[PDB]
Design a protein around this nucleic acid. Structure first.
Ligand code: MG
Ligand code: MG
Ligand code: MG
Ligand code: MG
Ligand code: MG
Ligand code: MG
Ligand code: MG
Ligand code: MG
Ligand code: MG
Ligand code: MG
Ligand code: MG
Ligand code: MG
Ligand code: MG
Ligand code: MG
Ligand code: MG
Ligand code: MG
Ligand code: MG
Ligand code: MG
Ligand code: MG
Ligand code: MG
Ligand code: MG
Ligand code: MG
Ligand code: MG
Ligand code: MG
Ligand code: MG
Ligand code: MG
Ligand code: MG
Ligand code: MG
Ligand code: MG
Ligand code: MG
Ligand code: MG
Ligand code: MG
Ligand code: MG
Ligand code: MG
Ligand code: MG
Ligand code: MG
Ligand code: MG
Ligand code: MG
Ligand code: MG
Ligand code: MG
Ligand code: MG
Ligand code: MG
Ligand code: MG
Ligand code: MG
Ligand code: MG
Ligand code: MG
Ligand code: MG
Ligand code: MG
Ligand code: MG
Ligand code: MG
Lengths: 80, 205, 85, 81
RNA sequence: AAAUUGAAGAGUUUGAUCAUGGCUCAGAUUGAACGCUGGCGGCAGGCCUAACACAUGCAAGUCGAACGGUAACAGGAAGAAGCUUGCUUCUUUGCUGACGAGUGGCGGACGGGUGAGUAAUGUCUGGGAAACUGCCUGAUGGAGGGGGAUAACUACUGGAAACGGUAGCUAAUACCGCAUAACGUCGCAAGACCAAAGAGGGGGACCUUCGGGCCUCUUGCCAUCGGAUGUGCCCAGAUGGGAUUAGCUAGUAGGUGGGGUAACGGCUCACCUAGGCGACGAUCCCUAGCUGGUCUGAGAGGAUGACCAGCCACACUGGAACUGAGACACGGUCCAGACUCCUACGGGAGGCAGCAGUGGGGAAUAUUGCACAAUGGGCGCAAGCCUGAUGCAGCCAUGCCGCGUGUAUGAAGAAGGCCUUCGGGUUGUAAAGUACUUUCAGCGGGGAGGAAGGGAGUAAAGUUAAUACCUUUGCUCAUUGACGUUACCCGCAGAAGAAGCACCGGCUAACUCCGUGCCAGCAGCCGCGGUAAUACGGAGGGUGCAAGCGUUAAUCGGAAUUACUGGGCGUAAAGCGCACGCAGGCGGUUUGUUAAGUCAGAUGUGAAAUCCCCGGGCUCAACCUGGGAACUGCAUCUGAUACUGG
């Protein structure tokens, strides 16, 4: 029912928040190659339960801060 | 918006008989027929590869009395439509009302049928059609108005045009002066002296 | 001014601004009182001015001067700020 | 409001009105929601100068749209005729 | 069933050939300019630069059914007229029709214009949660009883004028309390608290202070939860160029709380951490409104954003806010600055990037016109009033399309022009003459359609006390056109009023003569011109186009000459001098799982218009128009597991 997005973490040194890289897979509009492109999102979370090198699953909600709109649900493959 | 010049000159330079005159005397006995007009007659115009396409487009234009901006439109419709394009370019130049007057023989030539039409005298179906480039559909029963049934010069063309080759895609009635464009004319019912496929190659550059 | 219907609703504007500034500074005074009595611990004397401040915000809302959610942000900030003394 | 009104198209001296259900702030030829029929007052015989989706001009009046006067005369024409 | 059917090359390097590589032309096209020329009509298009400055009118008003009132019009009942025995005073009297000024309600936030800024605050596509929403509409309830000033006016006064000042009197749907109060706000709760307004049309007899309470309906007000509609907000994609810009940021990135707008929020403060963006291009510099589409192209692509339409931004430049549902407001408000105009020198007034219009710049773009008669829009119960939006007019060949300037006979192959082997050929059946026809312009005559409604009645029925007033429903009556001497047919006369432009060495269709003689000159490339020039200049003939024809500016094509579809690197321009190597690209082989790429289906959306296919209407076409495929996308749920990723 809900539209989550997986991603991987990059920076969580700040307090009560992580940042997540999401890895979409575009096809270039002319040359036919299958590139990778990444987008970087801020993810609010309580409890500060994520570190670098970790695969999370985020979902969209109201803007908690200035540049932040996403809260996570779970931490799969919890470690490096 | 019509070629007003002399007419045997245009039969001469195209080097064929294009029926621009009546038939009361032949084309040969009124002028030289092989010799090209100008000082340079008997210099026979053996001409280039593009020239044999241009003198082929100009023959089929100068038969009917069209100018090039009308004719380019008549090409674009015959590339738009289905079927062939020679067998759809030679349909539109026969559906003209200024040519279904003449093929029914209500007038003597192809540039008199334009006067019989464009002097408001040829009513298709029960309304006058002044404009000469009308696109006569099948089954339209073209008649003659009653102000121009009494002309000597329409029956003078009736007795003339009963003596040529009668067409097959038409049905004229003689005494009532009333035709019937029956169906659309096929390929070989318009004479094959028109090299057809040299009007395609000019505009399809 | 060039049109009569601009002059007339140019002098129907000060006649509304004076009243809409009087009846708004009255409300801000009566919220300043329940912010004066809100750090001095008077739970039985801040509550008095808050009960003097119920109708003089729930009336200036309904006469169309602030909006009802501004007339319900006050009365849920001050109620916690009173009941957590 | 929101309203059901005509909107003129076509060529000079020969009009052709469509009907639209649109917001009565907006322009005549401008923005609309559901183009629901036309009105061709220079029609010929045995062709149709009116064609009105009388389901949609009911569902869009039950949610409160003031039908303007020419559209009301059109409904008065085509329902009785 | 159909929605596509689509691709052309030539000249030029050398004595000569193949190859590579540029340069130039053929075609389509325009918000177009200029030269020569000009008959008509139909539909569209007309300040691309100076977002330069503006004279003159004009573009936003309405409501007496919200209220005091009479500034006039014109009727009234008075009655004092000269009394004519019937009337042509006028103070007075708002009592009636209406109504100048003013209070108030609603509208000026729509319609109309321009693109200066804006490389993501915008726009396009597809998703969301934390919000308000005038008029319109559905449901359930209310709609009591009091009050205070104040404009209009009157008196006096300041100022050149704009505009004021003072003191008295007057009302309501303007303004304020009390009561009332839930299905709403605040609250876990108990409980605490919150609104309002009337007017109009008719009335039987009961009250009837003479106005009315009383009965009736119509519309208006208040509060809550709902529906539509418009707007604010947020996130991931996409939307120019540059690295001879490689480092930017302190309210900056995140938290806990107070405050704040309608709502989330660094939105704004107070404290505690040290963070965020950047080689998938951050900051900075240059340039630009974007999209539906348009022009080209066989396509993939390349350039562009005018008219029509959706979005945003701006209103003399630079700011801020009030009124309000809605603006930080084109024809509103105050404050500075530049520039205009009045002044009595104290002080004032104005903003065409609204339609017209003048100056100026420029190669260049119109009339200071008619009408609300249609479709819209503001107010009004209605009639009506306003409407430079819109509907039509004027000018211009600026573009697309249609028609006309005769048709037929006519040989003595007339004269005159030119060529010439001095016979003749050629203009040329072309002209003349002989007969025929009258579209278009020209004068007459008749006459469609764009006109639905509104008005004054009468009939029933629905209401109620009511056979009233009213509302819808059937009819009968006189009715309403800016275009407009209209579209359009029928009469009269007579071939009469209607043909110009470019080129003729090759590419590229069309050949000869005279007059200059490396001069005067042509030119898009190759070349011509030095006394026989098919190239310069004239004439004769000729070819292509036609109410157009040419030349320049610009894009695309040809250019496979920026090449994904679609090219090259030993000598022609091109392999780093050679290596090791993190980021990045790619990965032998078998079974198993997962479903990201990929593949199939379905719903949702991709606005209308335009392009395309079948159809219908203006005498046909352009133009208009119905239905459908198209919009190659994007998201969601299902499925498939061969290949690729995990
Ligand atoms: Mg033409
Ligand atoms: Mg109010
Ligand atoms: Mg708070
Ligand atoms: Mg009619
Ligand atoms: Mg074909
Ligand atoms: Mg070459
Ligand atoms: Mg050479
Ligand atoms: Mg001229
Ligand atoms: Mg200006
Ligand atoms: Mg002026
Ligand atoms: Mg008045
Ligand atoms: Mg305004
Ligand atoms: Mg600009
Ligand atoms: Mg309002
Ligand atoms: Mg009030
Ligand atoms: Mg109360
Ligand atoms: Mg906070
Ligand atoms: Mg603005
Ligand atoms: Mg300003
Ligand atoms: Mg307000
Ligand atoms: Mg102005
Ligand atoms: Mg002022
Ligand atoms: Mg102007
Ligand atoms: Mg001028
Ligand atoms: Mg000038
Ligand atoms: Mg003028
Ligand atoms: Mg009107
Ligand atoms: Mg006016
Ligand atoms: Mg014209
Ligand atoms: Mg001679
Ligand atoms: Mg005429
Ligand atoms: Mg009429
Ligand atoms: Mg020439
Ligand atoms: Mg040639
Ligand atoms: Mg020349
Ligand atoms: Mg010589
Ligand atoms: Mg010579
Ligand atoms: Mg030449
Ligand atoms: Mg190409
Ligand atoms: Mg290319
Ligand atoms: Mg080029
Ligand atoms: Mg090459
Ligand atoms: Mg080399
Ligand atoms: Mg090497
Ligand atoms: Mg190596
Ligand atoms: Mg592999
Ligand atoms: Mg998949
Ligand atoms: Mg579309
Ligand atoms: Mg048709
Ligand atoms: Mg796999």
């Amino acid at each position: 029912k809900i539209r989550t997005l997986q991603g991987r973490v990059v920076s969580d040194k700040m307090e009560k928040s992580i940042v997540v890289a999401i890895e979409r897979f575009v096809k270039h509009p002319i040359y036919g190659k299958f590139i990778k492109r990444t987008t970087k999102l801020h993810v609010h979370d309580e409890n500060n339960e994520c570190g670098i090198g970790d695969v999370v699953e985020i979902r969209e909600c109201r803007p908690l801060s200035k540049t932040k709109s996403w809260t996570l649900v779970r931490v799969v493959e919890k470690a490096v | 918006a019509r070629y007003l010049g002399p007419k045997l000159k245009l039969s001469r330079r195209e080097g064929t008989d294009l029926f621009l005159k009546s038939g009361v005397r032949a084309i040969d006995t009124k002028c030289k027929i092989e010799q090209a007009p100008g000082q340079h007659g008997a210099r026979k115009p053996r001409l280039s590869d593009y020239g044999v396409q241009l003198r082929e487009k100009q023959k089929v234009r100068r038969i009917y009395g069209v100018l090039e901006r009308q004719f380019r439109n008549y090409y674009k419709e015959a590339a738009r439509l289905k079927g062939n394009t020679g067998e759809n370019l030679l349909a539109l130049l026969e559906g003209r009302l200024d040519n279904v007057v003449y093929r029914m023989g209500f007038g003597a030539t192809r540039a008199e049928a334009r006067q019989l039409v464009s002097h408001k005298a040829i009513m298709v179906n029960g309304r006058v059609v002044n404009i000469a480039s009308y696109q006569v559909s099948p089954n339209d029963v073209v008649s003659i108005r009653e102000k121009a049934k009494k002309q000597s010069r329409v029956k003078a063309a009736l007795e003339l045009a009963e003596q040529r080759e009668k067409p097959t895609w038409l049905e004229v009635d003689a005494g009532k002066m009333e035709g019937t464009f029956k169906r659309k004319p096929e390929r070989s019912d318009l004479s094959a002296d028109i090299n057809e496929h040299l009007i395609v190659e000019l505009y399809s550059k | 001014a060039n049109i009569k219907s601009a002059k007339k609703r140019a002098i129907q504007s000060e006649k509304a601004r004076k009243h809409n500034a009087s009846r708004r500074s009255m409300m801000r005074t009566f919220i300043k009182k329940v912010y004066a009595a809100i750090e001095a611990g008077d739970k039985a004397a801040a509550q008095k001015a808050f009960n003097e401040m119920q109708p003089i915000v729930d009336r200036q809302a309904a006469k169309g001067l602030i909006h009802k959610n501004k007339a319900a942000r006050h009365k849920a900030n001050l109620t916690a700020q009173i009941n957590k003394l | 409001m929101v309203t059901i009104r005509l909107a003129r198209h076509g060529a000079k001296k020969r009009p052709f009105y469509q009907v639209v259900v649109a917001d009565s702030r907006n322009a005549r030829n401008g923005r609309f929601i559901e183009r629901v029929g036309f009105f061709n007052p220079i029609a010929s015989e045995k062709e149709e100068g009116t064609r009105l989706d009388l389901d949609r001009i009911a569902h869009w009046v039950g949610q409160g749209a003031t039908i303007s006067d020419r559209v009301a005369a059109l409904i008065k024409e085509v329902n009785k005729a």
